[model samples]
Target: KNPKSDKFKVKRFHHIEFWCGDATNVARRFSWGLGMRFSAKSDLSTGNMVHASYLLTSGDLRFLFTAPYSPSLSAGEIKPTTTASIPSFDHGSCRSFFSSHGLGVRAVAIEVEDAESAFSISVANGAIPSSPPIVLNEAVTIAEVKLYGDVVLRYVSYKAEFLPGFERVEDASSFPLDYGIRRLDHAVGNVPELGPALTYVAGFTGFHQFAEESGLNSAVLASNDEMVLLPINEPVHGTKRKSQIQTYLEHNEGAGLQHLALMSEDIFRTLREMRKRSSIGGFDFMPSPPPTYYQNLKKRVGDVLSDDQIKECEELGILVDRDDQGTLLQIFTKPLGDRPTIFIEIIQRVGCMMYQSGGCGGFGKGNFSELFKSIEEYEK
Candidate 1:
C-alpha cells in the first residue's frame, strides 16, 4: 500500500440509490417502512414525482431514489407482470443515471481501489461501462457502469466527493448535518426467476450468495406462510402475483432491479435529521417502529446488547432489535409503489466485517426478514 494513497483516508462508501416504478411511492414507502419522516409532494406540478430528490443520510452512504417522467407508450396497458427472476437491462438498452440521467436509483457510488483500473476491469469482464474516468471541477474523480437501465442498476465511485468548499443544497430530510452514509451492506435486485440472474451477477461481479443474520426477535417475527412481507422477498417468501417482480416481468418480459442498501455512519443522527422533512405525499421522517418493539428488544437482546444503546436508539429515533442471535440496528423505507417495488434500508452493523453480502436479516441470518416485515406494512 502506498503511504500517500487515499486507500487509508478514504471513507468506505458514497451512497446507495434505488430506481422504482413510482419514485414518489418509493420515497413514501421508504419513509413509511423505515419509520423515518419525509417531505412528500415537494413538486405538485409533476404529481407523484420527484424532480430532484434526496433521501439524506448521516452515514457513509446516501440514498438517491428518483422517479423520472414516465413516458406514455402507444397502445399499451400497464398490466401487472409475472414475478420471477431478476430484471435484465442489455448493455445498449440500459439507462440508469449513468446513462439516461433520469429518475429512480440513478446510481450507487463508492470509493474504489482506483477508478481507471476498476473501470477497465469491469469493462473487460463484460460489465458495460458508461463514462470514462474524469476528474470533475469539484476534483472528485469518478467512473461508472449502467448495469441495467430499464429499472436502473448502476455502480459508481467518488474520491473526496464531499470536501469542504463544495456547494451543497440544504436538505432537512436527513438527520445530522455532518454525517454521511458509508458502506454498501447489500443491494437486492428483484427477478422473475431469481435463479439465472442470481447466478449471472454472482458469476460476473463475483458477488457470492450473501449469507447473514435473519433479524427475527420477540417483537418482529418472519411470517411463516401467511402475512405479506415488507422487503418483498421473491424465493424465500415469494412475491405477490402483481408485485414488483410480477409487474417488471409483465412490462419488460423479465425480472427487474428491486431495492438498495444505504448504510449509515450514525444511524441515530440520520433518523433525527430526516424526521424534519416529513410531508403528506413525499418521504416520511419519523421513526416508524412500533413503540412496543423497543420494550421487546430489551427482553430479547438486552443480555448481549447494552441498555444505553437502546436508550440512544430512543433518542435518535433509530429502531434496534435482534434476530435469534445477532443484534441489528435496522429501519426501512415506505413502499415505492402500489406494485411494491424498490425501497431503502439504513442498516448499522456491530463488530462485523463483510462486503455487500452479509447483514440484512433472513433465516440464513440476513436482515431480509426484518425488511420483509416493513414491506407488509403497506399492503393494501
Candidate 2:
C-alpha cells in the first residue's frame, strides 16, 4: 500500500556503493573490466581516517568502492579526525559487512526530493530507520533505512559536482574511459522469502510489482517514474538442488544485492570493448548456451532481432528473449569478488526508452531456465 504517492518521489538512482576488503584491487577490475575510470575519492589523506573510498563513474553510472582503513582485513581502528563537537562518521559497519558478505552491495543510493521528508515518509510507513537524515553539505543530503539483511537503502538528494567530501580525481589518461554502459537498468536482491520482503520495500518506496517469474519467485518492483527498478527474488523450496538465490544468501551470510544490470545502447559495441580486456583481469562471463539453443533461435524470438544480431549473440554467449514489450539481450558475469554472492549483468533493451513503462518489461522469461542451467554447469 503506497501512502500518499504524490507526497514523495524517488527521482533516480544516485549510486551503488560496494563494501569490500580492498578498494584498489576491485577498482582495477571494474576499470579494465567495464572501462569505468576513477572519478573521485575519499581516503586517510583527506582527513577522514575511517576508510578509503574510490568512485568510478562512466556516463550516469557511479560505483563507489570502499574498504576499511586497516589492511589487516579486520575491524578498522576508528580514530576520527573530527572537530568532535560537530559530527563524524564510522567505518565499523564496513568490517562486519565486508567480512561477512565479501564485496557485497551495502547501499543502493536513490535520489529523492528531500532526505528529511523521504526518511520521515518511509519510516512512517513501516520502514525501520537505520540512520537519521544527515545534511552532507550545501549541495547534498542523505539518510538511510535498512533493506533486507544488513544492507541499507540510502535516500539521497544532491546538486553538487559528484557529492561533497570527495575530491575530484584528475583524468590523466589521454585514451577514452567512457564505456558504452549508460546507467543502472535494475538491481536484484535475494532474500529467503520473496513476498514479505517485496511487500516491505514496496510499502516504503511506493513501488508496484512489474514482472514476476518462475522457480525463483521473483517480483520486479518499479517506482512511479519507472526510472527506478528493484527486482527481489527467493529460492523455490523443496527443490533437488539449491537455487542460486539460496547460494547467494549463504555466501553473503544473509540477503544482499544478488546482481546489478547495467544498460547499454549497443550491446555489440560494448561487449567488444569489454572482451578486448579479457586477457588482463576482465570479467569472466558464464558459459555459452548449447549450439542447439542458438541453432533454433529463429523459431522462438520470431524475427524480432536480426539474423546477424542473433548470430553475434550466439558468438558472445549472450541470452536473447522477446515478449510483448520487446527483445531483451542480457549476459551475466561471474562473481566480481572471491565469494559468489555478487555479480554483474549487462543488458540491452529494444523498442523502449525515451520513456518509462512498468509491468511492460521482459527480463528473458524464456531464458530463465537456461540461466540456471549455465549456473549449474559452472558451480559444478
Candidate 3:
C-alpha cells in the first residue's frame, strides 16, 4: 500500500548529509574504503566559505560530508567577522553538533514533488518546522523539519543534476577497484522516544509502521511507487541489558543516526575487500559470528546453500537468514568513529523484497536470536 497521496509525495533519497570533523578523510573512507566515487564539493576555495562539504556517490546513493571553517585565523588569513553564512544561516549549530554528537549524520533529504506543500503538511501533522520553503530557482526548491536529535529531514526538488551551488571536484578520483556497493538499503536512527518518533514520522510523512518485534521497532515510508524504501528503527525499553539503541544514544549524547545499510550485489567480494581495507584504512567491522550460530545454520537454510558456500560464510563471518520466499546475507561494521554511535551494515537480498521481509513479507525473525547475540558481545 502507498503511504503517500495527493497531500505530499516523496520519490526517493536526494542525499544524506553528514557533519564530520574532517571532511577530506571522511570522503576518503567512503571513496577508497567503500568504493563510492568522490563527486563534488563546496568550500571556501569553491566560493562557499561557511563550511566545506565533500560529496560521494555509488550507484544511486549520495552522501554529503561537511565540516565547518574555523572562526579564528592567523593575521594573514581572511576570516569572516561573524560565523553566519547569511541572514538565516546557522554556523554555530554545526560547531555545537560536532561538540555534542561528534561526527554523525545531520540531515536526511528526500525528493518530493512539491517542497512547499510537503513542508506545510508536515507542520500540520505535528512536525516542527525547521525552515520555510526556500526556492533556489525554477529547478530546485527545499524545506526542512526537525527530526530526532539535532538531525533534520530536508525535502528537496531538483530540475538540474545536482544541488545548486555545488561545483564538481575535478581532482576527485574513484577507488582502484570497485567494491560493488550499490544503493542504500536503509538508514536506521536511534531515538529515545521510539514509539512517538515512529508516530511522528508516520503522521507527518505518510509513512506507516511496517514491522515490530519485542525490543525492536520499524516504520517504512517509500516513494517511486514503493521502489525507494526508508526503514526507521528504534530500540524498545525494558530489555535486560541496555539495548544497542540505548548504547548509541548514550555515546552519541542524543537521538541520531545509528547506521546505514548499503546494498551489495556481490557481498562475498565486498566483505573480502572491506576486510582488506580494515588493515589499510582503519575501517573496523563487527567481530565474526560465533561458531554455534553457524553450526545451527544447517537446520535453517542449509538446503539453499552448498557446502562450499556455507564454508565461505563461516570464513567471512557473514550472517544468513531466510524465509519461504528468499534469503538475506548480512554483516555489520564497527562504529565508524571513536564513539560507538554510528556503524554500517552490508546487505545482499536474495529473492526478498528489498530485504525487509522474507517470503512471508515479514522480518527474518529467525535470525534475530543469533544476530542479537553477536551484538550483545560487541556492546560489552
Task: Estimate TM-scores for all models.
Answer: 0.52, 0.89, 0.85
Winner by lDDT between candidate 2 and candidate 1: 2
lDDT of each: 0.43, 0.76, 0.73
Across residues 61-121, which tens digit of lDDT does each residue of candidate 1 receive? Answer: 3455444343332113221231101112111232343233223444545555466665666
Best by TM-score: 2
Sort the predicted structures by TM-score, highest score first. Answer: 2, 3, 1
RMSD of 1: 11.9
Clashing pairs in 2: none
**Model 3 clashing-pair count:** 1
Candidate 2, 1-380: lDDT as tens digits: 32334337778888998877888888767888898878887776555555678888778998988776654432343333341111223456777777777788888888998988999999998899987887765677788898889878888886546666677776673235755998888898999999899889988877777644345878877887566888888988777776788788888898989999998867887788877776678988877787667766777675776788789988888888776767778888888878888889898887654564532347766787655554454433
Better model by lDDT: candidate 1 vs candidate 3: 3
Candidate 3 lDDT, 1-380, residue by residue in tens: 43344347777777888887789888787777787877777777666656778888878788888887765522233443432222123567888899999989888888888888889999998888887887663667888998778888888876654666677766535433468887777677778776787777766776644432456665665543554455666777787766777778888998898877787879999888888888788477877877667776787778877878888898998989875567878888888887998888888877655534411222345677866665565443
Q: Where does candidate 1 stray beyond 4 Å? A: 1-11, 16-59, 63-103, 129-141, 148-184, 213-257, 264-282, 285-299, 305-325, 336-339, 353-380
**Judged by TM-score relative to the true structure, which candidate is superior, 1 or 2?**
2
What is candidate 3's TM-score against the reference? 0.85
Better of 2 and 3 by TM-score: 2
lDDT (Cα) of model 1: 0.43
339, model 1: CA deviation in Å? 6.3
TM-score of candidate 2 to 2 decimals: 0.89
